[PDB]
Design a protein around this ligand. Structure first.
Ligand SMILES: *[C@@H]1O[C@H](CO)[C@@H](O)[C@H](O)[C@H]1NC(C)=O
Lengths: 48, 24
């Protein structure tokens, strides 16, 4: 790797792999939680 | 030495609740 190298240049790659399983969630988007409502029809969202 | 395993070694295949069902 030399600065005179376009395709021959270095690239920093980060791969984000998501463990999108049914265990407890621990890494979440910035979305704020509401209070919890019961016995009424609701447009709910738990952990996504 | 050796022995018979019988019906040992079943495990919960995934982190999901199920009840009164026969899951393949
Ligand atoms: C299992 O082991 C027993 C002896 O411990 C033997 O009689 C039998 O033939 C074996 N069967 C198999 C499939 O290995």
């Amino acid at each position: 790797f030399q600065p005179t190298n376009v395709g021959y240049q270095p690239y920093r790659v980060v791969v984000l792999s998501f463990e999108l399983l049914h265990a407890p969630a621990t890494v979440c988007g910035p979305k704020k939680s509401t209070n919890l409502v019961k016995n009424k029809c609701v447009n709910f969202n738990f952990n996504g | 030495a050796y022995t018979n395993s019988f019906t040992r070694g079943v495990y919960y295949p995934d982190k999901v609740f199920r009840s009164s069902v026969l899951h393949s």
